[PDB]
Design a protein around this nucleic acid. Structure first.
Ligand SMILES: [Mg+2]
Ligand SMILES: [Mg+2]
Ligand SMILES: [Mg+2]
Ligand SMILES: [Mg+2]
Ligand SMILES: [Mg+2]
Ligand SMILES: [Mg+2]
Ligand SMILES: [Mg+2]
Ligand SMILES: [Mg+2]
Ligand SMILES: [Mg+2]
Ligand SMILES: [Mg+2]
Ligand SMILES: [Mg+2]
Ligand SMILES: [Mg+2]
Ligand SMILES: [Mg+2]
Ligand SMILES: [Mg+2]
Ligand SMILES: [Mg+2]
Ligand SMILES: [Mg+2]
Ligand SMILES: [Mg+2]
Ligand SMILES: [Mg+2]
Ligand SMILES: [Mg+2]
Ligand SMILES: [Mg+2]
Ligand SMILES: [Mg+2]
Lengths: 154, 227, 46, 394
RNA sequence: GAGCUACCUAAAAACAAUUUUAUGAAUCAACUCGUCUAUGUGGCAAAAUAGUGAGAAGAUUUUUAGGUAGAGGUGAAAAGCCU
RNA sequence: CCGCCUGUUUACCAAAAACAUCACCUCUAGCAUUACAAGUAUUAGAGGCACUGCCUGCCCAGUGAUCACUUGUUCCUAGGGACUAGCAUGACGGCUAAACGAGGGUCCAACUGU
RNA sequence: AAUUAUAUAACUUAUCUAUUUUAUAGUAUAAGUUUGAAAUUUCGGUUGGGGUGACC
């Protein structure tokens, strides 16, 4: 069954050259320190990762590992990699500036309970703003444009 | 100065004396830690090519008689002495082998499936799909190398053309030609894992030395701040 | 424990470790003999 | 298929020949003239060496195929160490014989008469056991390689004392370590026996026949059992360089031409080196049968036929504690076919003279549980031993 | 340079009496180790003596020969040991 | 009080609460002629850690309820398709358990030139 | 920490063979890139000795 889902989502897995497949796997192992079983889990769960080039997958993983403070198991369980970087930064940064999110400290503790990752990403934007952040739709649109300008300057 | 003890050139059923290593190479330096001592042991040569026709005999299926089922110090499974014609040889013993039984070694890829009794050796093609097997051979005529441990069995998942898919105990699937022999049934000593060592002295008997007393994701430049 | 007694004599060990046949077995040992011959030693080996 | 013998232990391959040899027309310069090896000259090639005369201490045997007695057809030889996998069943097939359990009635009756009883028989037997196991040595516990031979010689001496009653016992003698052999065929198989006897008792007169001609003929109904898939020749020694010989144990002209009993011992101290009971009995049949056949062939030539006068031979075997008795009658010499008149054998198995012996008293809490000496002595076994000895006189 | 010491290979060896049982059990010699105190401090001794203590059929102790060498070896890790 | 227990360690100032240890847990590996091993996933190597039972066990997509919407992820152009029904949480505490110790403390009796 | 790093591990381009109608296999070597087992070298000054500050 795992092959069936992979074939449907990513028909080119057979067509892709050897080099391309190895790099995606090698990044997950040497640079991301994923275990053997998780590697099979990720490939089956989100086949689109194979299409994605390296040096973008590594950045996305480190964004969660360091900036968001997530752990290996959390990433695998929630299908974090499936989502796009733009969505991750737009939502996470908005919450962080509002003070509703905290990077876990060195000890591993947080003064305030952080919002569940499903609420941050899985839910719709309307529910996410209305419930998780309790903000206004107009403010988010302004923030997205402001964030775009900052990236351009960067 | 180290000389390997594995120098005998002719097959026999007589026990052979073994020399221990200590975990040292032929140079004399430790290569593997945790090995040393134990009880003295004798080696009994096991023949893993089930379908070996006797000298000056044609290649057709033959039968053999089970003389003994015996404990072996060098393995987790138990072995059985089997005699046929004018020849005796050791082999591995399945779960339910008993003394005095007769067993069949076959060379015939039946166009239809051959009824399978535990312990008989048949080419993989003949056996029906889903039949447990052990002592599997990767290549025809090589000799068994997989699934020869105690209580372990494999499964014949599928057959297409002249190639079959086997499910190893680790569950990693594998494929081979259908012209390589295999023997039906699980390996003996199904309850090996249940043992309890009990005291430290028992491990020293088996030839195991104690452990030693002594007690990496690099962030990218944008990750340095929130490390 | 009391030290000073590390020499536990054994003729078989002595001749095998430092003897004539042992010295000639390697080129480094052969050069040991040549140095002692040039100095003039009365005892080339054990 | 796994190959036995790791490469590192095998002899190393010869050095490659110098490239100067490849070049045609060029004579290499070697160190042969110097008479010693040097690393910077070519290695000579020497022709094979011949001494020019024979030195006995450095004799070298010719290969098997060059031996004058090499024969393409194989001969299977049965000797002392051979241990038959199938036991008696295989032994019976090889000798074309039928088995009857229990000793012959005539022999058994010899000892039921109290006139044949020895004086103080039970007490004297107990003394022999104690002497064999404890008293004969200066050591605390003697070993089997000593007392197993000793018990048998002492018992023969006890029975041999009956010459006072029967003067006719002076017509037999005994020899030590005699050898026996025979060649015969079974269903196209060439078979030979090469063996030895611990002691052999020979008589001046043949033993009485056990079975009448009517019983001999009735054996034709019996069929020899088979043991497929195991071949009859399992555990026999296949030889391609052999000679055909027959040997009773003595050369022609011996005054005592009739062998009476054959004795076989299991004196090895270590258990794995000692035959098990069934395998001991199988050895006794073949060794005794060879003695009978060699005696027949001697009298009636090499022809095959049903014998007018059957030949009877006895055999006794022990490890020093357990005893086994055998009587054989040879009825026919035509063994090529598996159907016809069959030979007959009577066996009495696993007869215990004593169960156990203590060389030191067993003490628990300063109480002597077991005294020294034999345990559970059975006098019946000796009477069977005595009966066989007396047979042919009384 | 592994005749000391650390670990390993091969061939050998020792273990009384008593109570339990059926054993890395118990009491306690031989033997192995070294808790505590005093004497000694160019000492009998460059680590001992006198008492007193721990184990003592086991992961026990002991003998003979062989192996691993300094950018290294060995280590039931004390940064211990390798004349 | 500490450590489960018999064991081990700084030869020459430390013998212990340290090290090892049965038990339990994590990671890596589908294979032959010199170690692992003449072995093959109930196997081998590396590492962590007292055991035992006993509370605390939750990132399955939400609501309807095996069914419809709302989500999410994707494409083809705000429209149109594709995918998400071959599965389904977890993380602490107090526990100790009798036995055992030339381990560190407290106490009674007897005993004595302390 | 600075400076290197044919220890391994990967790739890439040549070179040399096979084939193939361009083409995929491999590779006694050279040049790059990625990992880093290791290698060589260093530890400014005044402020008591520190601890935060500073200062030249
Ligand atoms: Mg540790
Ligand atoms: Mg000195
Ligand atoms: Mg030594
Ligand atoms: Mg010594
Ligand atoms: Mg004792
Ligand atoms: Mg010590
Ligand atoms: Mg004690
Ligand atoms: Mg004690
Ligand atoms: Mg004890
Ligand atoms: Mg430490
Ligand atoms: Mg320290
Ligand atoms: Mg020194
Ligand atoms: Mg302790
Ligand atoms: Mg202790
Ligand atoms: Mg030690
Ligand atoms: Mg000290
Ligand atoms: Mg102590
Ligand atoms: Mg001390
Ligand atoms: Mg500890
Ligand atoms: Mg203590
Ligand atoms: Mg008081």
């Amino acid at each position: 069954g795992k092959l069936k889902r992979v074939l449907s989502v990513c028909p080119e897995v057979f067509t892709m050259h050897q080099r391309d497949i190895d790099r995606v796997v090698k990044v997950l192992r040497e640079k991301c320190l994923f275990t053997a079983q998780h590697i099979t889990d990720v490939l089956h769960r989100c086949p689109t990762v194979l299409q994605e080039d390296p040096n973008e997958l590594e950045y996305k993983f480190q964004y969660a590992y360091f900036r968001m403070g997530l752990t290996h198991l959390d990433i695998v369980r929630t299908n974090f990699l499936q989502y796009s970087i733009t969505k991750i930064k737009q939502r996470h940064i908005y919450l962080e500036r509002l003070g509703r999110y905290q990077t876990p400290d060195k000890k591993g503790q947080t003064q305030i309970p952080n919002p569940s990752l499903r609420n941050i990403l899985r839910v719709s934007e309307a529910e996410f703003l209305a419930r998780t952040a309790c903000s206004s739709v107009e403010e988010f649109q302004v923030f997205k444009k402001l964030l775009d300008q900052e990236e351009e300057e960067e | 100065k180290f000389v390997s003890w594995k120098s005998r050139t002719k097959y026999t059923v007589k026990p052979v004396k073994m020399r221990k290593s200590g975990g040292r190479d032929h140079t004399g330096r430790i290569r593997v830690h945790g090995i040393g001592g134990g009880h003295k042991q004798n080696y009994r040569m096991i023949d893993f090519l089930r379908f070996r026709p006797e000298k000056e005999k044609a290649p057709e299926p033959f039968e053999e008689k089970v003389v003994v089922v015996r404990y072996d110090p060098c393995r987790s499974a138990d072995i059985a002495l089997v005699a046929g014609g004018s020849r005796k040889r050791w082999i591995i013993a399945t779960e339910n082998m008993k003394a005095g039984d007769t067993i069949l070694n076959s060379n015939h890829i039946g166009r239809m499936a051959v009824a399978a009794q535990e312990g008989d050796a048949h080419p993989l093609g003949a056996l029906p799909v889903g039949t447990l097997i052990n002592n599997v051979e990767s290549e025809p005529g090589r000799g068994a190398q997989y699934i020869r441990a105690a209580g372990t069995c494999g499964v014949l998942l599928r057959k297409v053309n002249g190639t079959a898919i086997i499910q190893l105990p680790s569950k990693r699937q594998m494929q081979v030609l259908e012209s390589c022999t295999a023997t039906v049934g699980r390996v003996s000593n199904v309850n090996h894992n249940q043992r309890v060592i009990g005291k430290a002295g028992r491990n020293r008997w088996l030839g195991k030395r104690p452990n030693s007393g002594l007690w990496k994701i690099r962030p990218l430049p944008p990750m340095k701040s929130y490390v | 424990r009391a030290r000073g007694n590390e020499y536990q004599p054994s003729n078989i060990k002595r001749k095998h470790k430092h003897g004539w046949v042992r010295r000639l077995s390697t080129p480094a040992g052969v050069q040991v003999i040549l140095r002692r011959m040039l100095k003039g030693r009365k005892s080339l080996s054990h | 298929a796994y190959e036995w013998g790791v490469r590192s232990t095998r002899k190393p391959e010869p050095r490659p020949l110098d490239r100067v040899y490849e070049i045609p027309g060029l004579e290499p310069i070697t160190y042969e003239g110097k008479k010693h090896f040097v690393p910077w000259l070519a290695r000579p090639i020497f022709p094979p060496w011949e001494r020019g005369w024979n030195d006995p201490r450095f004799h070298r045997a010719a290969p098997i195929h060059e031996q004058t007695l090499y024969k393409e057809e194989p001969c299977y030889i049965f000797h002392q160490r051979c241990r038959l996998l199938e036991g008696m069943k295989q032994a019976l097939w090889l000798t074309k014989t039928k088995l009857i359990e229990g000793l012959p009635k005539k022999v058994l009756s010899l000892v039921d008469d109290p006139a044949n009883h020895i004086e103080n028989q039970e007490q004297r037997v107990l003394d022999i056991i104690s002497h064999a196991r404890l008293w004969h040595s200066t050591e605390d516990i003697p070993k089997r390689e000593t007392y197993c031979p000793l018990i048998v010689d002492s018992l023969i001496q006890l029975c041999k004392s009956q010459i006072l009653k029967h003067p006719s016992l002076a017509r037999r003698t005994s020899a030590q370590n005699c050898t026996l052999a025979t060649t015969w065929n079974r269903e196209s198989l060439l078979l030979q026996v090469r063996g030895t006897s611990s002691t052999i008792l020979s008589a001046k007169d043949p033993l009485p026949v056990i079975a009448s001609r009517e019983e001999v003929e009735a054996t034709r109904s019996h069929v020899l059992e088979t043991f497929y898939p195991i071949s009859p020749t399992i555990d026999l020694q296949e030889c391609h360089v052999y000679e055909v010989k027959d040997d009773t144990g003595f050369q022609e002209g011996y005054p005592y031409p009739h062998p009476h009993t054959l004795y076989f011992l299991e004196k090895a101290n270590l258990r794995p080196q000692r035959f098990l009971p069934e395998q001991l009995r199988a050895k006794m049949l073949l060794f005794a049968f060879a003695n009978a056949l060699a005696q027949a062939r001697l009298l009636y030539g090499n022809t095959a036929k049903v014998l007018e006068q059957p030949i009877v031979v006895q055999s006794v075997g022990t490890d020093g504690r357990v005893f086994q008795f055998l009587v054989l009658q040879l009825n026919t010499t035509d063994l090529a076919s598996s159907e016809g008149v069959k030979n007959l054998v009577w066996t009495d198995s696993d007869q215990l003279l004593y169960r156990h012996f203590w060389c030191r008293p067993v003490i628990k809490k300063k109480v002597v549980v077991e005294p020294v000496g034999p345990v559970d002595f059975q006098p019946e076994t000796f009477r069977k031993f005595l009966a066989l000895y007396l047979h042919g006189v009384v």
